[PDB]
C-alpha cells in the first residue's frame, strides 16, 4: 500500500506497484541514511522477467550516485554524472522518480538531480519496486 508505514520494515523491501510505469507516473521514497552507511539502492523492475529498468545506487564511501540497468542478465554502462552528490550520512531524504515519455527524472530533497533515458522500453511492464542497503525507510508512495 502506498503510504504504508515502513518505520520498522527490514531491508530489503520489495513491493508490487498498483499502477506500473508510464508517462506521468511518480514514485517517492522517504527515509534516512544511516550515519554509518556505505551504500543503498532503489530499483524499478519488471517483475516477470526480473530485468531492472532503473537501478539507483548512492555509494557513500566514494560519494558517487551510480545509475544502470540490468537487462538480459547483464549490467549496462553506468551513468555517474552529477552536479552534486545529494546524500549524506544520517540525513533525511526524499527521492522522487518521475517517469516521462523518453526518460526518468530523479529529484533528491526537492531538487532535480538527473535524467535517465529509458533502456527498458516496455514501461507498463515495470511493476516492482525494490529497496535495500544502509537506510531507515519511512514511507513509499506512488501516484
Amino acid at each position: 500500500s502506498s503510504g504504508e508505514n515502513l518505520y520498522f520494515q527490514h531491508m530489503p523491501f520489495a513491493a508490487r506497484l498498483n499502477t506500473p510505469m508510464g508517462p506521468g507516473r511518480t514514485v517517492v521514497v522517504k527515509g534516512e541514511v544511516n550515519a554509518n552507511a556505505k551504500s543503498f539502492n532503489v530499483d524499478l523492475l519488471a517483475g516477470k522477467s526480473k530485468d531492472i529498468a532503473l537501478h539507483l545506487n548512492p555509494r557513500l564511501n566514494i560519494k558517487a550516485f551510480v545509475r544502470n540497468s540490468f537487462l538480459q542478465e547483464s549490467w549496462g554502462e553506468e551513468e555517474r554524472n552529477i552536479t552534486s552528490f545529494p546524500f549524506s550520512p544520517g540525513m533525511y531524504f526524499e527521492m522522487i522518480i518521475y517517469c516521462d515519455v523518453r526518460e526518468f527524472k530523479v529529484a533528491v530533497n526537492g531538487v532535480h538531480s538527473l535524467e535517465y533515458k529509458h533502456r527498458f522500453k516496455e514501461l507498463s511492464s515495470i511493476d516492482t519496486l525494490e529497496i535495500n542497503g544502509d537506510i531507515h525507510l519511512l514511507e513509499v508512495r506512488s501516484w
Binding site: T26, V28, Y92, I96, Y98, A107, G110, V111, E139
Partner: peptide
C-alpha cells in the same frame, strides 16, 4: 497530500 517536506519539482 504526498507529505513532501521538500516539495515536488515535477508538479
Amino acid at each position: 497530500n504526498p507529505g513532501l517536506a521538500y516539495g515536488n519539482p515535477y508538479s
